[PDB]
Amino acid sequence: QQQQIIKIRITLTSTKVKQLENVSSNIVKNAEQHNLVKKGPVRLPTKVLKISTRTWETYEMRIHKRYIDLEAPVQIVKRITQITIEPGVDVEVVVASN
Amino acid sequence: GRVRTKTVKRASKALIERYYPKLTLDFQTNKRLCDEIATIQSKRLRNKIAGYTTHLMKRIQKGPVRG
Amino acid sequence: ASNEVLVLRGTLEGHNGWVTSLATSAGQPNLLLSASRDKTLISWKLTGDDQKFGVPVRSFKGHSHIVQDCTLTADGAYALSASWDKTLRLWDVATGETYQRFVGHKSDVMSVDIDKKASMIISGSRDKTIKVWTIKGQCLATLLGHNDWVSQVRVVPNEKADDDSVTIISAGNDKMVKAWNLNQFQIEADFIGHNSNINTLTASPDGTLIASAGKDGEIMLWNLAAKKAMYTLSAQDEVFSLAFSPNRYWLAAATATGIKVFSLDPQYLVDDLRPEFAGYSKAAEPHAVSLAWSADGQTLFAGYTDNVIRVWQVMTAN
Amino acid sequence: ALISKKRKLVADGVFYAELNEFFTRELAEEGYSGVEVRVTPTKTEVIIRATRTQDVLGENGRRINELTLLVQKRFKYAPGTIVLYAERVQDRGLSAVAQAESMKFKLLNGLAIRRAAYGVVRYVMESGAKGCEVVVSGKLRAARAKAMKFADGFLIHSGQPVNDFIDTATRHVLMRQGVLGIKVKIMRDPAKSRTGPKALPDAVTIIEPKEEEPILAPSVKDY
Amino acid sequence: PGVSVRDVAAQDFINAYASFLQRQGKLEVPGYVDIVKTSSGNEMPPQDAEGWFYKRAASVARHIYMRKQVGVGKLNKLYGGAKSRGVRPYKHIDASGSINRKVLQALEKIGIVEISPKGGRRISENGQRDLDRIAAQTLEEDE
Amino acid sequence: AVPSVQTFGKKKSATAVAHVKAGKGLIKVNGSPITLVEPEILRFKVYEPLLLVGLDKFSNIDIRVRVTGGGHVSQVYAIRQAIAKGLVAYHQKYVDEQSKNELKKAFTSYDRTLLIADSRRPEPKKFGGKGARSRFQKSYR
RNA sequence: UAAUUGCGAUAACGAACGAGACCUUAACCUACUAAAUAGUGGUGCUAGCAUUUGCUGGUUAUCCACUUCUUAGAGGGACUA
């Protein structure tokens, strides 16, 4: 027997909300289409960072960080983390809230 | 000030030229109709064309205009 | 001459947008639901006084764009509202409290009607669809076929105890009225003939006629019970709202200049309710975009384009 | 790991910078057009989108071996935590990087200054561009350095349209008299954009309506 | 009706509570009173010279009723101020940590404050008691 | 649960969240009634909307306001904005619309940012200077 | 005019760059999404003060409910109507 509740907390962080929120909503819908339990995406505030550079000059920055919690069996966690690989997006797969 | 270029006048003009009904002087339905009828690349420039269609239809409701 | 004609009884003012729909309650006759362009609906308790015909009793804050249609169930407890934020809302008329949201319209919901049964909620929209709903949110029909926007849909108050045909009737801006039969959710009558589009349509209260017009002003009267063509009343202006009186055959027509109240039987124009507008210019005349005969057809309610609900009680001759 | 996410993303940018500059210096005579870095489980793929990737693949296991080894031994990458793939880039006429390297080469080929330049520009427009531009600037045979532009098609110059449809590439071709900035700016076809705006922001298309159907006296069809 | 020390204005309460702990005589005014600066962001010693410690004890006590906890360094950050840098503009500095810490130890000895978990100092049940009581007194002397 | 609305008032960076709940008439600012604020000149300003429509008006609605941010002037303006917005929200949602229009009349005739959102905010500083318009100080060499 | 921005006369007519247009920001979201890595109340448990109900505490979990304030996404919203 397999598929035990091991309470995955997925931290999703990237610099482009298109790829990041595509993988985020894909985590969400791929989870809920075989009926998982999510904490549907919690949007951490984007980071605002500023860069003064030299006749002066300024840049800035965008850290988009969210967490979706899939309290889930390890089977479809392994599936949802092997599938939907993408350039640019950092996936952090951590475990039960401690 | 709010002065309009040749292209906004030209687009409102051609919208009269082939659409004098469907576009009269109510801006809020000119909004939806220019959404329905023209591929204007921004909502702003759509609202600018829609406000000048408001102006032009508004001044054709009381007589003809040059050209 | 005449033995009865409409006299301006009073005015209402709590609005800021164009009052785009009014609705009459046979349940309490002192009710005025009012859909307006200012993203809310004002429910009014109608006092009847000469200067202030009623008092504003609630704003329905919660629609997020221009509210176009409101219909009362005739009891007057349900405020069914259509707005341009692609929403329909079932408000309580005296509480607020949206009971149920109807979302699924792809563009501005221009129409809402419920049946005489007060069960089945139809809605026409600027996505040229028709969506038929329960009270609790189920979009159960999507009627397609209009080539331009479904301007209004109204449930036929059906003649023979709703004789298996919950007929609804669409006006479309492809110059066609389509009577739809909600048995198999398909076409029941193509009523063609309009020169400009059709902004509005109304059925006779027994559910046998159709009076429909748009910008040209050609109110095509149809024998909806026969599903054929009768005649056409020309009002010469851009027609915005049409309604038979629930007792008599008076069609009040919301023109581009004001109101033209016609009689159908016998065929004559009863009155031209353009109240005198001081200040306003020739084309700048405030004109009704909404108007409804009362629960008894005695007072004509009218939402104009100067943000004012004006009321007309029918006075007998002297 | 134990890297702050700020420092993590800045370090990833530094890594992609070393990728871009190093593989620019390295595979320039393969017509290097770009790297992309895609980390999957068990792999980290640096894709060399380039023109001449058969000179990257190597004899039945070569230099792509040696390039993964170079990246491996500098970056302390385990074998298999660095995986380089190569890829024949599509339609290098539309590639400002590849045609700028072509200008670099044809200047180092001792070829012409204007005939071959407008031939390249012609070849870009034969690839169905919306516009193209080649700049050659530096000193040859005159102590006073000079410049020549080579354009065809149509070009925009300001705005987010610059950020949408043009590619500009500066390439120092080192010749015996001096050093020469190449700048190839190709306006790609907005009809061929495929990932955003299909035309200008200036574009407004008014549909010419219909030969309409007038009155058609009622003519009721019953259903 | 009921009272709290949040229900009372701060300044008149702090004057009344300074005079109240003056009445109490439970002091811990260590022995370097009025030879001390009492805040590193100041120059001169305090003006009254018999007290300033009951004033600061009142301020710390009411400020700890109104908060979850504050520390020694939090009271240094509070009662510090802008000391003039002379030829240069002003800047904020943490106060003297000893003085504020001894106020904390004084109110702990009476049972007006207690060393908090998470760090800091919570208001004690006798602290809440005595503060709300003479806060009711400070209102009923102005009734 | 009582008949109640919840609003907020915003001046430059001071935010005020107000709970207009049904109760016996408290108007509280962070631990304390509305009379204890100190500024102590601006207390009259935090008295204002109560005094435009009749002072009673809260004997059916407790008002509990919390303050975050800004400075004491922006604080008082934010909380009086929050209280007047909540008052017209309660007399909209629970009391009828014309009562809310009486509140609108008695406020709007006097209006002192009780209701509407002011759009002025600190506007960005630029390099070559210390502020939003002023440049550096020069000497033409 | 902010602009060869245009209008508007006018040996042409349709073009191009630029400006505009586009990028982004301070504004509104009581309608959507969620948030023990943001806030809300109630509830547990309970400290003080008055009691007649209450006021003020506290509680990264005592739990329940909400997303209005907070976040940040979507668009709408304004075009000088």
- Does the beta carbon of D2 lie under 8 angstroms from any beta carbon of chain A? no
Q: Which of B22, B24, B28 sits opposite C66 (nearest CB)?
A: B28
3-state secondary structure of F80: helix
Alpha carbon of C196: minimum distance to chain B alpha carbons (Å): 8
Alpha-carbon Rg of chain F, whole angstroms?
19
Pairing type for strands F32-33 and F15-21 reads: unpaired
The string of DSSP codes covering C230-260 is: EEEEE-SS----EEE-SSS-EEEEE-SSSEE
- Does the beta carbon of D208 lie under 8 angstroms from any beta carbon of chain C? no
Handedness of CA D170, D19, A63, A82 (dihedral sign): positive
**Residue E13, CB, strand G, below 7 Å:** no
CB–CB contact D206 B14 (8 Å): yes
3-state secondary structure of D79: strand
The tokens of E19 are what?
């005079």
CATH number, domain with residue F132: 3.30.230.10
How far is CA F90 from its chain centroid?
Answer: 16
- Does the beta carbon of D36 lie under 8 angstroms from any beta carbon of chain A? yes
The tokens of D8 are what?
């993590």
CB–CB contact D37 A63 (8 Å): no
Cβ under 8 Å to D: C residues 132-191:
175, 186-191
Q: Which nucleotides on chain G have any atom < 7 A from a protein Cβ? A: 1-3, 5-9, 16-23, 25-31, 33-37, 39-42, 47-50, 54-61, 68-73, 75-81
* Cβ atoms within 10 Å, residue F137: 7
Number of separate domains in chain F: 1
- Does the beta carbon of F108 lie under 8 angstroms from any beta carbon of chain C? no
**Residue F45, CB, strand G, below 7 Å:** no
CB–CB contact B38 D204 (8 Å): yes
Answer whether C297's CB lies under 8 Å from C247's CB: yes
* Spacing of A43 CA from G36 C1' in Å: 15
* Spacing of B23 CA from G20 C1' in Å: 24
How far is CA A87 from its chain centroid?
Answer: 14
Residue B13 lies in a domain: yes
- State the Cα–Cα distance between residues E142 and C61, nearest whole angstrom: 47
Resolution (A): 3.8
Query: Where is F76: in which H helix or E strand?
Result: helix F72-93
Residues of chain B with a CB closer than 8 angstroms to some CB in chain C: 21-22, 24, 28, 32, 61-62
Query: Where is D76: in which H helix or E strand?
Result: none
Answer whether A41's CB lies under 8 Å from A28's CB: yes
- Where are the domains positioned within chain E? 1-143
Quick one: which of C48, C46, C39, C32 has its CA closest to C18?
C39
3-state secondary structure of D185: strand
3-state secondary structure of D103: helix
- Where are the domains positioned within chain C? 9-318
3-state secondary structure of A41: strand
The tokens of C201 are what?
């349509």
Answer whether D148's CB lies under 8 Å from D135's CB: yes
CB–CB contact F128 A58 (8 Å): no
A56 neighbourhood in chain F, CB within 8 Å: 127-128
Counts of helices then strands in chain A (DSSP H, E): 2, 6
C222 neighbourhood in chain D, CB within 8 Å: 218, 220
- State the Cα–Cα distance between residues C60 and C96, nearest whole angstrom: 6
List of residues 6+ apart from D14 with CB closer than 8 A = none
Alpha-carbon Rg of chain C, whole angstroms?
18
- State the Cα–Cα distance between residues D105 and D120, nearest whole angstrom: 12
Place of tokens 């001071």: F14
In terms of CA atoms, which chain F residue is nearest residue A58?
Answer: F127
Please report, as a single letter, which amino acid is at residue C87. T
Which other chains touch chain C, taking contact as 3+ CB pairs less than 8 Å apart? B, D, F
Please report, as a single letter, which amino acid is at residue C92. D
List of residues 6+ apart from C30 with CB closer than 8 A = C45, C46, C47, C48, C54
End-to-end CA distance of chain C: 12
Pairing type for strands D146-153 and D43-50 reads: unpaired
- State the Cα–Cα distance between residues A1 and A58, nearest whole angstrom: 58
**Residue F122, CB, strand G, below 7 Å:** no
The domain over range A1-98 is classified in CATH as 3.40.109.10: no
**Residue A66, CB, strand G, below 7 Å:** no
Q: State which residues between 193 and 222 of chain D bring their CB within 7 Å of strand G.
A: 201-202
- State the Cα–Cα distance between residues C85 and C88, nearest whole angstrom: 9
**Residue B66, CB, strand G, below 7 Å:** yes
In terms of CA atoms, which chain D residue is nearest residue C220?
Answer: D218
The tokens of C4 are what?
């009865």
Q: State which residues between 71 and 110 of chain F bring their CB within 7 Å of strand G.
A: 85, 89
Superfamily of domain C9-318: YVTN repeat-like/Quinoprotein amine dehydrogenase (2.130.10.10)
The tokens of C63 are what?
């629609």
Angle subtended at Cα C113 by Cα C298 and Cα C12, rounded to the nearest 5 degrees: 45
Answer whether F11's CB lies under 8 Å from F80's CB: no
Alpha carbon of B39: minimum distance to chain C alpha carbons (Å): 17
* Spacing of D31 CA from G68 C1' in Å: 58
CB–CB contact F97 C59 (8 Å): yes
3-state secondary structure of D202: coil
End-to-end CA distance of chain A: 26
Pairing type for strands F62-68 and F27-29 reads: parallel
Angle subtended at Cα C35 by Cα C34 and Cα C38, rounded to the nearest 5 degrees: 120
Answer whether F114's CB lies under 8 Å from F106's CB: no
- State the Cα–Cα distance between residues A4 and D108, nearest whole angstrom: 66
In terms of phi and psi (left: phi > 0; alpha: psi -120 to 50; beta: otherwise), the region of D97 is: alpha
- State the Cα–Cα distance between residues C184 and C180, nearest whole angstrom: 9
Which other chains touch chain E, taking contact as 3+ CB pairs less than 8 Å apart? F
Residue B34 lies in a domain: yes
Residue C297, judged by CB atoms within 10 A of its CB (0-12, 13-18, 19+), counts as buried
- State the Cα–Cα distance between residues E82 and E88, nearest whole angstrom: 12
3-state secondary structure D152-184: EECCCCCHHHHHHHEEEEEEEEECCCCEEEEEE
CATH number, domain with residue B52: 1.10.60.20
Q: Do chains B and C touch by CB distance (3+ pairs < 8 Å)?
A: yes
Quick one: which of A93, A89, A33 has its CA closest to A69?
A93
Cβ under 8 Å to D: C residues 214-253:
220, 222, 227-229
The tokens of D138 are what?
């530096």
Number of separate domains in chain B: 1
Domain that holds residue B50: 6-61
- State the Cα–Cα distance between residues D58 and E17, nearest whole angstrom: 88
Domain that holds residue F133: 1-141
Residue F76, judged by CB atoms within 10 A of its CB (0-12, 13-18, 19+), counts as buried
B41 neighbourhood in chain D, CB within 8 Å: 197, 199-204
- State the Cα–Cα distance between residues C202 and C151, nearest whole angstrom: 12
Length reported for chain E: 143
Phi, psi of E10 (to 5 degrees): -75, -50
F128 neighbourhood in chain A, CB within 8 Å: 56
Quick one: which of C78, C97, C77, C101 has its CA closest to C89?
C101
- State the Cα–Cα distance between residues C43 and C309, nearest whole angstrom: 12
Alpha carbon of B12: minimum distance to chain D alpha carbons (Å): 10
CB–CB contact D220 C195 (8 Å): no
The string of DSSP codes covering chain C is: --SEEEEEEEEE----S-EEEEEE-SSSTTEEEEEETTSSEEEEE----SSBS-EEEEE-BTB-S-EEEEEE-TTS-EEEEEETTSEEEEEETTTB----EEE--SS-B---EE-TTS--EEEEBTTS-EEEE-TTS-EEEEE---SS-EEEEEE---TTTS-S--EEEEEETTTEEEEEETTTTEEEEEEE--SS---EEEE-TTS-EEEEE-SS-EEEEEETTTTEEEEEEE-SS----EEE-SSS-EEEEE-SSSEEEEETTTTEEEEEE----SS--STT---EEEEEE-SSS-EEEEEETTS-EEEEEEEEP-
* Spacing of C304 CA from G48 C1' in Å: 63
Sheet of C167-172, strand order: C150-155, C167-172, C176-181, C186-192, D221-222
- Residue B1 gets which letter from DSSP? -
Tell me how far CA of residue C280 lies from CA of C20, C256, E60, in angstroms.
Answer: 20, 14, 70
CB–CB contact E4 F38 (8 Å): no
Please report, as a single letter, which amino acid is at residue C199. N
Quick one: which of A2, A67, A70, A66 has its CA closest to A31?
A70
- State the Cα–Cα distance between residues A84 and A22, nearest whole angstrom: 10
Please report, as a single letter, which amino acid is at residue D103. M
Cβ under 8 Å to B: C residues 160-179:
173
Phi, psi of F135 (to 5 degrees): -85, -165
3-state secondary structure of F46: coil
Answer whether C177's CB lies under 8 Å from C201's CB: yes
- Residue E108 gets which letter from DSSP? H
- Does the beta carbon of C42 lie under 8 angstroms from any beta carbon of chain F? yes
Please report, as a single letter, which amino acid is at residue D88. R
